[PDB]
Structures are given as C-alpha cells and as structure tokens.
Amino acid sequence: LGRKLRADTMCGQNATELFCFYSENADLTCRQPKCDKCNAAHSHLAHPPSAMADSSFRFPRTWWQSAEDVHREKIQLDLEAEFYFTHLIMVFKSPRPAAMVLDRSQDFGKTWKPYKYFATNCSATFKKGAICTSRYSNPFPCTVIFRALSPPYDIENPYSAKVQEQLKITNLRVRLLKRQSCPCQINDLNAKPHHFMHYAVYDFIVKGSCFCNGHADQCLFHVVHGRCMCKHNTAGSHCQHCAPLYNDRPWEAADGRTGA
C-alpha cells in the first residue's frame, strides 16, 4: 500500500492481443465484454503494476492481472524497513481459486513458508484451524476471509519481541495455481469472442500500523515510515529497549492494557 509492488511484465507486452472484461451484473449474470487495448504507450493504454498500489484519489479504479496467461505469477513488494500487519484479507475480482496461499517473509526476503492457506480442497495448493480449512473458498461467484491473530491471541497481547515475529514482515508474495474465468454469455454474437485471458484483481491494501512497539504517538502521497520517537524515554527504531535512566527495573514491552 502506498509503495511499489514489483512483479512480472504487464499485459499484452509480448502479444498485441485484445483483452476484455467479462464483468457480471448484480443479477449474477455476465455482461457484454468491455473490450479495450493493453499496451505501454500512454497511461490510459499503459497500466503497469503500480496502478493498484498508488494514491487512488480518482473515481475510476485501477485494474490489473497476470503478465501473459501465466499461472506462476508472483507479486514482489519491496520494503525500506520493518513493517507490521493486522490480519489477512483477500479481494479477487476473478473467480477465487481453491489454490490460494498466504505467505509471510521474515527479513529482507530471506525466508519463506506457507503461513496460511485455506480452501475447500486445500490440497490444491500442493487441528485444521490454521494449516487449511474447508468451506472457505468457492469457484464462484467471481464479482477467502481469515484473521491472523489466533483466538487465544486476541487477549493478553503485549508488544514484546515474543510476538513481533508473528506480525513483523519484510516482503509480500502470493501464488495462485488454478486457472479459471467465471462463466459468461460467451455466445453473445455469432462469432465467438477471442483473447479473453484475464485475472481480474481489484486492489491490495493490507493496512499496517507504523511499527513503534506501541509506544510512539507519531512516527517520522504521504506514507507511513519506520522511524519512531517512542515515549517513556525509549530509543531505537523498534523501541525494544528503554533509556538507561531507570532501565535497571525489570520490564517487558509496554502492553496497552496499562502501559507498564
């Protein structure tokens, strides 16, 4: 959000092929394709990946999809510092496939793991409360909801390093395997349409509080930085240590319940 999200090439670059949106009406019925042209000439005809992650102050919304009918499409989200996340969100205008995986990176893109992934057949990605759960993903309609914090994690949640690793991130990626475009009245005219490849994705904004260890009131379009002037005489970007004036007293992270 509010920053660059590097990825593969945009649409139509290696093939000057027509693309169209098979959007759907409120009656769960597809509408006639709103055929346009994808290129790299003008902003209207040139829509790099940055369109999703940029100041969206205009009524028209920024569209995006894969590079060129490629299944293994990934999104790179570089960071200039440490970040924090609240929960998991998923908006996907195209039909949401069961082969959805949510992954978290620890530091400088040097770690990888299947953080969370849920679907009716979670085997598609390759306790049943975090590894994967059923009845959460469906092929249709075209146009997954989960929360990172565990049920016992909602209460008694100080801000020490013991929980930072859970919600401290360095880069973002996501993988989708299954390919499908939700059904339409493709027999709109006598001649069938063509070059309908698309993965309608609305936008991605995973709000992340300015990481200040729950101490700072203000941390250095305008975007959120990673430098905090934490109060309680605390120093450091992460504010994990206090000033030596009275540090001798044992302490842990100032939990929001009382700010010890």
Partner 1 sequence: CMPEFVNAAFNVTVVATNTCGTPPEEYCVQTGVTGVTKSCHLCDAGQPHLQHGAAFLTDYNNQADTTWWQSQTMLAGVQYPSSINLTLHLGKAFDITYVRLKFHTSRPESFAIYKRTWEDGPWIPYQYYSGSCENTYSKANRGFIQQALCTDEFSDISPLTGGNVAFSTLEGRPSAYNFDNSPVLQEWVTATDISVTLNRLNTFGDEVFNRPKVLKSYYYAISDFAVGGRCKCNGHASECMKNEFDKLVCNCKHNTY
Ligand X SMILES: CC(=O)N[C@@H]1[C@@H](O)[C@H](O)[C@@H](CO)O[C@H]1O
Residue 155 sits in the site that holds partner 1 (CB under 8 A)? yes
Residue 87 sits in the site that holds partner 1 (CB under 8 A)? yes
Residue 51 sits in the site that holds partner 1 (CB under 8 A)? no
Residue 16 sits in the site that holds partner 1 (CB under 8 A)? no
Residue 14 sits in the site that holds ligand X (CB under 6 A)? yes
Show Cβ contacts of residue 38 under 8 Å, excluding neighbours closer than 6 positions: 10, 11, 12, 19, 45, 47
Spatial distance between the Cα atoms of 141 and 208, rounded to a whole number of angstroms: 29
Closest to partner 1 by CB, 18 vs 206, is 206
Q: Report the nearest approach of partner 1 to the CB of residue 68 (Å).
A: 29
Residue 134 sits in the site that holds ligand X (CB under 6 A)? no
Closest to partner 1 by CB, 79 vs 163, is 163
Q: Is 254 helix (H, G, I), strand (E, B) or coil?
A: coil
Within 10 Å of residue 111's Cβ, how many Cβ atoms? 12
Residue 226 sits in the site that holds partner 1 (CB under 8 A)? no
DSSP code of 201?
Answer: -
Q: Report the nearest approach of partner 1 to the CB of residue 245 (Å).
A: 22
Chain position whose Cβ is nearest to ligand X: 123
Spatial distance between the Cα atoms of 98 and 94, rounded to a whole number of angstroms: 12
The count of chain residues that interact with partner 1, using the rule CB under 8 A, is 32
Among 34, 147, 194, 241, binds partner 1 (CB under 8 A): 147
* 3-state percent breakdown (helix, strand, coil) of the chain, nearest 5: 5, 10, 85
Residue 247 sits in the site that holds ligand X (CB under 6 A)? no
Q: Which helix (H) or strand (E) holds 103?
A: strand 100-104
Greatest Cα pair distance in the chain: 82
Spatial distance between the Cα atoms of 28 and 245, rounded to a whole number of angstroms: 65
Among 16, 86, 111, 123, binds ligand X (CB under 6 A): 123
Closest to ligand X by CB, 14 vs 247, is 14
Residue 23 phi, psi dihedral angles, 5° rounding: -60, 170
Determine contact, residues 105/112, Cβ cutoff 8 Å.
Answer: yes
Query: Where does this chain bind partner 1 (CB under 8 A)?
Result: 56-59, 86-91, 135, 145-147, 149, 151, 154-155, 157, 159, 205, 209-210, 212, 214-217, 221, 254, 256, 259
